[PDB]
UniProtKB/Swiss-Prot annotation, chain A:
Subcellular location field: Virion; Host nucleus
Similarity remark: Belongs to the herpesviridae major capsid protein family.
Disulphide bond pairs: none
Function: Self-assembles to form an icosahedral capsid with a T=16 symmetry, about 200 nm in diameter, and consisting of 150 hexons and 12 pentons (total of 162 capsomers). Hexons form the edges and faces of the capsid and are each composed of six MCP molecules. In contrast, one penton is found at each of the 12 vertices. Eleven of the pentons are MCP pentamers, while the last vertex is occupied by the portal complex.
Lineage per the UniProt record: Viruses, Duplodnaviria, Heunggongvirae, Peploviricota, Herviviricetes
Superkingdom field: Viruses
Oligomeric form and interacting partners: Homomultimer. Makes the hexons and eleven out of twelve pentons. Interacts with triplex proteins 1/TRX1 and 2/TRX2; adjacent capsomers are linked together in groups of three by triplexes, heterotrimeric complexes composed of one molecule of TRX1 and two molecules of TRX2. Interacts with scaffold protein; this interaction allows efficient MCP transport to the host nucleus. Interacts with capsid vertex component 2/CVC2. Interacts with the small capsomere-interacting protein/SCP.
Protein name: Major capsid protein
Amino acid sequence: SLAHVVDQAVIETVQDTAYDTAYPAFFYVVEAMIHGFEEKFVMNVPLVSL
Amino acid sequence: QLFAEYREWHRSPMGKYAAECLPSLVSISGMTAMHIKMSPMAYIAQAKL
């Protein structure tokens, strides 16, 4: 009896992000510096915003 | 101290319906029609309409 909260458009968006050729690789460096720590994300939030 | 299920106005199945609604005017009218008293003279009032 579930109702889905995501429509087809946002799935299209995520699929487009998957098939991106020019996904900015610098993001990975950010992710590499974040590596799943809460406090360091709170430290680096004004960069992930930009 | 705060809640007893049997000594309550709104039992568990009435919450069970309300959890699984697909919120719209149809569900509003359903929940409104679930509050109807189950009584003899309430059966008279139901039988008129």
